[PDB]
From a paper:
Here we describe subclass A3 evasins, which are unique to the tick genus Amblyomma and distinguished from “classical” class A1 evasins by an additional disulfide bond near the chemokine recognition interface. Structures of chemokine-bound EVA-A revealed a deep hydrophobic pocket, unique to A3 evasins, that interacts with the residue immediately following the CC motif of the chemokine.
To achieve this, we mutated residues Tyr44 and Leu39 in the CC + 1 binding pocket to Ala and Pro, respectively; Pro was chosen as it occurs in the corresponding position to Leu39 in several class A3 evasins. In the case of L39P, the affinity decreases were only small so this mutant bound to 21 of the 24 available CC chemokines with affinities tighter than 100 nM, compared to 17 chemokines for wild type EVA-A. Consistent with their increased affinity for chemokines with aromatic CC + 1 residues, both the Y44A and L39P mutants exhibited substantial enhancements in their potencies for inhibition of both CCL2 and CCL7. Identifying the structural origin of negative energy contributions at the CC + 1 binding pocket enabled us to reprogram EVA-A as a more promiscuous CC chemokine binder.
Residue numbers in the entry:
A (entry chain E): 8 to 72
B (entry chain A): 17 to 101
C (entry chain D): 7 to 18, 20 to 75
D (entry chain B): 16 to 102
E (entry chain C): 17 to 74, 76 to 101
F (entry chain F): 9 to 29, 31 to 70
Write the structure that this text describes.
């Protein structure tokens, strides 16, 4: 909606702890990021530059229909 | 100045499903820019008829036939999904 | 918007022709991609793995006026 | 010296059907086999339903049943849902 | 002078379902702009009783799905877990 | 959880509407909900041309 991330995560989250990720129209966001939904229903912010974020998105995408 | 970046590469509105699966394309063709474009071989699709498409709302009412795009045809595979617009 | 995915990539792009981008499409999309909006108001699909796409997103981010 | 099971926990079970044309899933991860209670193997497809839901099941598909996978006797749910019925 | 109406057409709060189906109207009648109005023929509804309607929470009870015909919510075997 | 079982038979003048809202995905009938100056809610079908024009003329303000 109008939801951006003011802070990124420090550590690399465990692939086993992420349930999904969400899209964003972050054109007007000060910082660009990805938003992970965790198995415990929490939302975490991650920097798309880091490689582990792309790897997590890959391992979570290859699990759909 | 107002030319198309590249032939057949614009996004398309897929169909949604209450079954929690990949978003599937209604058919294997889409109107991209002013031209008609074919989805790649293997792209997930739905195969619907006129009567079904007219009865399509934002909540599932018809059982939509899942299929896979091969040579411009959405070849069915037996599976069905509750799909909505 | 939430049901908008890219089945086909651009493959062939110039930074001077892009007006904005959308970082990622839906999680439940068959193919994951970024969607660029061009100066001519057209939407193009690009593969986020390619380096030029990330460079375009970076040079397009460094163009939104931040405060002091 | 004649009437044993011949194999502990190994008799078939009536699964639940689905109008979506997918694999037949076991209601829960447990079945009453030869008077004992049995757990499906880790990874077996299952449905995760509640008492009121399973009771609200007819022969025409009407309710969305939560698909899941059997792990350690629990039908761990996953995103997917199916229109499922009893036949 | 300025407080008129415009034909029975104001919205009504439906009942929800955790199974992902159309939102259904509790009964086939609604109090719209101070009048009593009948839903259209074919409109999805729930068919509940006084005790049932009182036993409705935010899903725990099985509500009888039905279709509105001539102002009556005719049931059709199906039931859904519905909530307020 | 607010849906419209009936649309406005006639047609209302833009000068009598204060704003509009959109209804839910799981509603049996899809429509727009206009709020009138007298604080009443009317349902309108977005297919009708005057409805889209009224919503446009009410947004641009």
């Amino acid at each position: 909606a109008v939801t951006c991330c003011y802070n990124f995560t420090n550590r690399k989250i465990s692939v086993q702890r992420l349930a999904s990720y969400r899209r964003i129209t972050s054109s007007k966001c000060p910082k660009e990021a990805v938003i992970f939904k965790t198995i415990v229903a929490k939302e975490i912010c991650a920097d798309p530059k880091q490689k582990w974020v792309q790897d997590s998105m890959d391992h979570l995408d290859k699990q759909t229909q | 100045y107002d030319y198309e970046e590249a032939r057949c590469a614009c996004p398309a509105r897929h169909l949604n499903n209450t079954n929690g699966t990949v978003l599937k394309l209604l058919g294997c063709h889409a109107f991209c820019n002013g031209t008609l474009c074919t989805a790649p071989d293997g792209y997930p699709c739905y195969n619907l008829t006129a009567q079904q498409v007219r009865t399509l709302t934002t909540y599932p009412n018809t059982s939509c036939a899942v299929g896979v795009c091969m040579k411009g045809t959405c070849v069915k595979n037996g599976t069905m999904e509750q799909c909505f617009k």
